[PDB]
Amino acid sequence: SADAQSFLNRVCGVSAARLTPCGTGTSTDVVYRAFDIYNDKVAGFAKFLKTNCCRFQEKDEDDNLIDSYFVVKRHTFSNYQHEETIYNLLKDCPAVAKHDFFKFRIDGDMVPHISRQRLTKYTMADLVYALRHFDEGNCDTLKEILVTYNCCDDDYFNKKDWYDFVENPDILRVYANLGERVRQALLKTVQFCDAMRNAGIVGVLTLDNQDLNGNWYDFGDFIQTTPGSGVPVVDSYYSLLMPILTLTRALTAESHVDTDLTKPYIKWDLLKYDFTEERLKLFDRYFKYWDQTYHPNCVNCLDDRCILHCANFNVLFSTVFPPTSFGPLVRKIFVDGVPFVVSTGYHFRELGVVHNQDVNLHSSRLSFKELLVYAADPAMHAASGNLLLDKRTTCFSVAALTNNVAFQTVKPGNFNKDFYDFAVSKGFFKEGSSVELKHFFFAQDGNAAISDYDYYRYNLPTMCDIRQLLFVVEVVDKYFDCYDGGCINANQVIVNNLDKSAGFPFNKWGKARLYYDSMSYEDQDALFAYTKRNVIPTITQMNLKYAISAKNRARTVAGVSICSTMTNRQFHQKLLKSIAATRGATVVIGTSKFYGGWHNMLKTVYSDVENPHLMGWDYPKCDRAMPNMLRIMASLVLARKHTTCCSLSHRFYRLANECAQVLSEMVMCGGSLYVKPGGTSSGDATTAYANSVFNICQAVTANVNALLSTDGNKIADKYVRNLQHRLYECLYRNRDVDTDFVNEFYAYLRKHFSMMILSDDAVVCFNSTYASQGLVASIKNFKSVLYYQNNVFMSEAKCWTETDLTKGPHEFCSQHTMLVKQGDDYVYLPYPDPSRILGAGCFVDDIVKTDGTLMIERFVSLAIDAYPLTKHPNQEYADVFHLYLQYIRKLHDELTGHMLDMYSVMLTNDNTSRYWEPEFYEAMYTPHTVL
């Protein structure tokens, strides 16, 4: 048409561009794009429908389509003039796109148009939204972005699991092919901020106003001041983008000679460990207009909210520096004139450089606690060992403490043939039966411990959305508000069992008892006081487990040093005991399932939700994949009870000790030393409680992400819409805590999303109609959160949902639920897998079975576990309890028979029959505690 063709060649300006319409005449083009909105009635970060634009794609010499677009738009005459005024002040910056203002008549009237030349198809908001809301069911935009910039080919996606981080670790390489674009965009944003400051222009910078070449447009919400006094607002631009900077490794060019990827690496000297000026240079180069103080060394931070802020920047900047400069800092001291080599400080990836306060170079004969501290340090062990190059693993290798490598194996189990024969003689283990054996003792070969250790390759450096985390931390703290803690003295500490290992090297000379006897109460107090001014690094040892299981992978635990454990108990036990003594809360550590406990827990979690459904989910590789920023945060929440007993400096040094002891320390695997990249160490003194804090944190962040990614123009209830508007302000517009809104959001969560938590196991009761409308979290929100904040893919085949509350959760702590009738009232009881019970009967470690008459209490305990199976509709399940009763009777008869034949001792059957009658076992599940 004459109109359409004249419009086309007028859009073609004085440039030489061969344009082709995008399926339109003179009319607009409608798309579906991600926006960051805040306009006094709607707020959030979500996908809306874009309506008023005409798009023309550009061709090249060979008549092929290229990634360049002219995007024209019609609007009102007052916006035209304002945007033209603002542009002429900014037109000379190289980071601004080229604009063209003209007037064209679509009818008898003339309307104004603004054309932007040579944009890309997507913006910086589309990429961030794609990576923070991942769903492999529909990921068209991410795939298009990856192929249009030569990160991969289009047939790369025909592989299945191409996105999984654990299967197919190669996807990381693909994502690292975007880093340079992100770095270029950052540099252009700094240029644009400088230009805005000089011109005298005030406005907020959003991700959807920058394209993937780094240019800026859309000056409609800006205003003008006097030159030299412009102020750009950059709070939600940087915070929403932070998680993507570590996933693409955007700062990899900084380790080359001139920040050029075609040149060799920088060669630092090996003795350098400071890098404090490099960190300030990096901050001033990429984050110039972020207006909050940054401390390269977190020992200068003001409160614990400050530490999180600065450690987040440290996590990113530490990826540029050599890995041999991190860890303990040592020097030479003299005792009686002989020289040692001892640790006097530490260089943390997240916290910077820390120096010990009480170090003395010249001293006479040293004392008992000084000997303990010097034997615990890895300095003298590593200094006098051999150099090691271990090619079996990709972790960092330090030294070999001896001249041979050790290869430890795992043995098979012992067969209890009598119980198996008795079971076979009663009709068990037939063909086609629904009960069969699938729990065994699996054996392992020589190179099994090192293979298991190499699973720390799944721990990656992760940067968080800092403004989002600072709100979630305040909400998580409301859950831990009915307890009390603080420090205790050495004579108030409770230790369950003193005949367990003390770790390396203390396990050369005795158990833990030996060390709690030799140290007096005033020696332990002095050691505790020493760790509030100094850092003591220790060595953790790796142990292979020998137990029954259903899958054939070796399991390992961490044995931590006695020096760490002794002081952590004095710091944390008062709080840990207080959580375990409480009933009716969210964390249910300490509650027993017997005497009506299971029923009480279920009734408490049902609470009064309105359209209730039940839900449970899964954490892949939970302890090997936990980011370091969330373990730090978990430690800071437990230490908030120390407001009167400890100073700010004391609290900082306790945090530093914890990090150097159980977060990234030396591990002894075999007889060699390795460096741990991160993750949790299952075996430290606060494991289950820290896991609880972490679990609650992830749930809260999934709810926050659910609510803000919802189109607020479609929320019918005006109360829930006002709540969405206030969440955005408290994240990205407010700098201090707002205690009235933290209470309000916390109550809202306790009415519609009710949790039961036990040290990363969980059950949730949630309002089903709110979740369908996006007002409450679902399984898809958890999957998205774990992808960008945990570096794993969660398959929804390990998650369950239940729509009927008369059936209790599908699984909790390996138990099932059933609603039975017990004396006029219905109650919920737990029961196990029958395979687990029968396997415990059949396979054991010698002596412990294969002769039942030596230990009949084992079978009484197993029968207590198996009792509730008598209530099951399936008949093969109740036979398990009856089989155990009959075998107990048989063992008692056989034992009393032996004593009379070969010896003449005659035993009596007084109050023993109670063990093969069901009344003893029924009373364990009835609501009245005994003993």
Binding site: F35, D36, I37, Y38, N39, D40, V202, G203, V204, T206, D221, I223, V233
Partner: peptide
């Protein structure tokens, strides 16, 4: 749409 001072 992202404004400085909506009210």
């Amino acid at each position: 749409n992202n404004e400085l001072s909506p009210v």
